[PDB]
Amino acid sequence: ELFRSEEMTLAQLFLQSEAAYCCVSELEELGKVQFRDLNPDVNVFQRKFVNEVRRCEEMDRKLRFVEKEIRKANIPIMDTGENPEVPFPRDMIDLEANFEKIENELKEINTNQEALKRNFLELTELKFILRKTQQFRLGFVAGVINRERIPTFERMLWRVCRGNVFLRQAEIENPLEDPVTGDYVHKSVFIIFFQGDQLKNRVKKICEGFRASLYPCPETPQERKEMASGVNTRIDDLQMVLNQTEDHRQRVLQAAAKNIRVWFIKVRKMKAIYHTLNLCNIDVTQKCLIAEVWCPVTDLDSIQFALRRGTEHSGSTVPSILNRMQTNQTPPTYNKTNKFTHGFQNIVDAYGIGTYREINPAPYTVITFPFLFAVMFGDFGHGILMTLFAVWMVLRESRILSQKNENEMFSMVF
Amino acid sequence: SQGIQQLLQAEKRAAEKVSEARKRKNRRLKQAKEEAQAEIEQYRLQREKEFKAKE
Amino acid sequence: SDADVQKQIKHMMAFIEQEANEKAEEIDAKAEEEFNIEKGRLVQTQRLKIMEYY
Amino acid sequence: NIIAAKAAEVRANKVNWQSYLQGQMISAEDCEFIQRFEMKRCSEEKQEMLQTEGSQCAKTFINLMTHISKEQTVQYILTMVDDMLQENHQRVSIFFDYAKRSKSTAWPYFLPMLNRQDPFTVHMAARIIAKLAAWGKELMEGSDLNYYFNWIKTQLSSQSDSSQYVQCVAGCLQLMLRVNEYRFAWVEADGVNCIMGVLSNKCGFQLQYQMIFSIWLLAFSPQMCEHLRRYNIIPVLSDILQESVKEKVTRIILAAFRNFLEKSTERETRQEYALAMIQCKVLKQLENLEQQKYDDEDISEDIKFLLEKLGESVQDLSSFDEYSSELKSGRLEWSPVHKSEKFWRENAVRLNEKNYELLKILTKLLEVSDDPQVLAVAAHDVGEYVRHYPRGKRVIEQLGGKQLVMNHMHHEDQQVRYNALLAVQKLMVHN
């Protein structure tokens, strides 16, 4: 009865190594046991399950990477169903291969999509550059720039060359996308004509100075037709691959947006299980795990059931039975609670925690704290408003429970 | 607890049995060169009897 | 009961001692094959010298 | 498990031998010898009795098992002979000497006891037979060997007391398979196929070890290593490495794998097993095992041995000559060479040899092949060729391979589409 802290038993168990994983998981689903740490020397390389935890740690990072890419694409995560722990057999390795498959597919497909999109946009610029240039020992260069740079660009050509350069700018029929920012900018083609290699270097240096995109071109309209056919071939090819590239990216992200909820639950459960298994120990000849726990006395049956369940879900017969201890330290203090009593327990616990079996202040607090607060705060109108808000929080509880945890003020009052 | 004490004693006896088995079986492997002589002398005697029959 | 714990202790003690016998048979069967090979090496080596002499 | 507990109950449940003498079921000498077995208790007293009276020792035990229909009595007599030989294996000579005196093999005295109704009695018969046969200089052969092996196969294939009796069957087989003659004789039995089935049906870890230990015994002989390829051992045992936590099961599988790669007659057969291990994820499973520490280092030594031998197989297969050979024979089947980064990084230029011969083969296979796997491999190779040798893009276009991968990116199989999509994406990376 909650007038005092509930009865707890220190217990020891001999845990069969194959069943151990399943046992810990049933105990974590039961949620009524606290593990005593037997390893003061525990550390990243001293934890008995180094690889298993490291795999979980990396698998979580793989999930974070994939999830962030899906969220950046605004694709809805399914967040649906309730999932058990992964089994004791290392199916987690095949899951890790699936995680790598998705990760590597996204990295490769993103890299390719970016490169292909850049090439497609560059060839799109080249289509316009050739079409304008086709209207025309001399030399020349040709390219494209954002229109807003043309005044400074043209004046610098007339300054670096001592008043001598032929230039024709020409506007593009539509704006074109920036490969980095996605900004559609009103770019314009330019062609610059000169004589000799000295002028070639000046016009090129100024084009580089304004970051103008230069391109090669044939010397005559007739050869420019053959180049334009090559460009048409390459840009059409780029479109065909971009279509399937984007389609594949969409399939991969879509499949992953279902898998992530499942995989997250699985990985987080695995990490917790293995972290708990790292609290057990193994002496110089030992085979069965030594472990020790605190459990409520009422639930020694519930943990012994959970231990048997772990075995019955495993390739072994050993029930991993526990004993009560006698060399007992003072157990951790517990009280069962519900939606009403939890808050009233927290405002006591926040100041202090009773000794084992001590009287609990909380049941007296459930009324006495509201009473003293109401004596301090007593006003009919505020009493109504506070009542209305608290009622709203209860009647919309199912909706409200889905809301952001980051609003700690709202989380406190809720 | 007496349970872990008794379990560790059985686990220690188990580790001793396999460690002693390794030493016994390693010593037995060294005997193979000495035991080989019993067959080697029979092959000598077989060839000797055949040789006398050929004479 | 503490008696059923003691039955589990007995079972675990017997189990690791049974595993010791199985490991000893593993060491044994391996070492017998090595013994048969090492005996065979010296037998065939001297048997060839015997065959050459006769 | 249960047979040892039942044997202890049977050692407590001693019979009145004098009643069998009074009922004329046994001789006075048989009754007097077996009564003295319960009084000669120390190792010296037992040894003096059995070594001085060996003909009567054999006669006593044989008569008391053979002439008595009362199952509990035959449980007790079989327990005492199993104990007598378990104390010292040299004692088998008593039954062989009696068999020689009686102008017989030893097997016909014990083999009738496999036909009893009580499961413990017939398994105790199997145990004494296994000791006698495995430790004896006389060999079980022909009809006797076939009958006992058929009994073993029958009982073993039946796969909790039932499974624990089958552990005793497996233990009897493990004792027998110590003898090379019995190993070769067992090769003709479908019991190896039965083991593959029982393992595939997820039996308990105790049986996994006891079965795989029997396979590990067979793996010591080069001839059996070549002949037993038919059973697909590695696929099953690799799943057992991923599924079963037990170090004993792990260790015996590592030892079996070591035995196949060490003992096979030919480098080609050693490589065939190593390739099957690489295909069956074994290298990656070994890497996860190698970083661990154990109370037995033979695990780590076998892991290092296997990782080295699989490493050699990977380096062998990573040769451009092997790649050329696989292409020349059309064997585009996900061989480890296709994903060896070292191979492409250091050798991709070689595909240009004899005026693009290997590239012509890849494009020809992408033109001609119906098999999605061959197409996907061929596409994968085009992609990796371009990835490690970008100069090749123009050659692949000249050979028409660009259009072929661009067709196959819309193939009905996602694996073809994926590999074709990677290939076509790399072809369009730069001019």
Automatic annotation (TrEMBL), chain B:
<comment type="similarity">
    <text>Belongs to the V-ATPase G subunit family.</text>
</comment>
<comment type="subunit">
    <text>V-ATPase is a heteromultimeric enzyme made up of two complexes: the ATP-hydrolytic V1 complex and the proton translocation V0 complex. The V1 complex consists of three catalytic AB heterodimers that form a heterohexamer, three peripheral stalks each consisting of EG heterodimers, one central rotor including subunits D and F, and the regulatory subunits C and H. The proton translocation complex V0 consists of the proton transport subunit a, a ring of proteolipid subunits c9c'', rotary subunit d, subunits e and f, and the accessory subunits ATP6AP1/Ac45 and ATP6AP2/PRR.</text>
</comment>
<feature type="coiled-coil region">
    <location>
        <begin position="4"/>
        <end position="53"/>
    </location>
</feature>
<protein>
    <recommendedName>
        <fullName>V-type proton ATPase subunit G</fullName>
    </recommendedName>
</protein>
<comment type="function">
    <text>Subunit of the V1 complex of vacuolar(H+)-ATPase (V-ATPase), a multisubunit enzyme composed of a peripheral complex (V1) that hydrolyzes ATP and a membrane integral complex (V0) that translocates protons. V-ATPase is responsible for acidifying and maintaining the pH of intracellular compartments and in some cell types, is targeted to the plasma membrane, where it is responsible for acidifying the extracellular environment.</text>
</comment>
UniProtKB/TrEMBL annotation, chain D:
<dbReference type="InterPro" id="IPR038497">
    <property type="entry name" value="ATPase_V1-cplx_hsu_C_sf"/>
</dbReference>
<comment type="similarity">
    <text>Belongs to the V-ATPase H subunit family.</text>
</comment>
<dbReference type="InterPro" id="IPR011987">
    <property type="entry name" value="ATPase_V1-cplx_hsu_C"/>
</dbReference>
<protein>
    <recommendedName>
        <fullName>V-type proton ATPase subunit H</fullName>
    </recommendedName>
</protein>
<dbReference type="Pfam" id="PF03224">
    <property type="entry name" value="V-ATPase_H_N"/>
</dbReference>
<keyword id="KW-0406">Ion transport</keyword>
<keyword id="KW-0375">Hydrogen ion transport</keyword>
<comment type="function">
    <text>Subunit of the V1 complex of vacuolar(H+)-ATPase (V-ATPase), a multisubunit enzyme composed of a peripheral complex (V1) that hydrolyzes ATP and a membrane integral complex (V0) that translocates protons. V-ATPase is responsible for acidifying and maintaining the pH of intracellular compartments.</text>
</comment>
<dbReference type="InterPro" id="IPR016024">
    <property type="entry name" value="ARM-type_fold"/>
</dbReference>
<comment type="subunit">
    <text>V-ATPase is a heteromultimeric enzyme made up of two complexes: the ATP-hydrolytic V1 complex and the proton translocation V0 complex.</text>
</comment>
<keyword id="KW-0813">Transport</keyword>
<dbReference type="GO" id="GO:0000221">
    <property type="term" value="C:vacuolar proton-transporting V-type ATPase, V1 domain"/>
</dbReference>
<dbReference type="Pfam" id="PF11698">
    <property type="entry name" value="V-ATPase_H_C"/>
</dbReference>
<dbReference type="InterPro" id="IPR011989">
    <property type="entry name" value="ARM-like"/>
</dbReference>
<dbReference type="InterPro" id="IPR004908">
    <property type="entry name" value="ATPase_V1-cplx_hsu"/>
</dbReference>
<dbReference type="GO" id="GO:0046961">
    <property type="term" value="F:proton-transporting ATPase activity, rotational mechanism"/>
</dbReference>
<feature type="domain" description="ATPase V1 complex subunit H C-terminal">
    <location>
        <begin position="317"/>
        <end position="431"/>
    </location>
</feature>
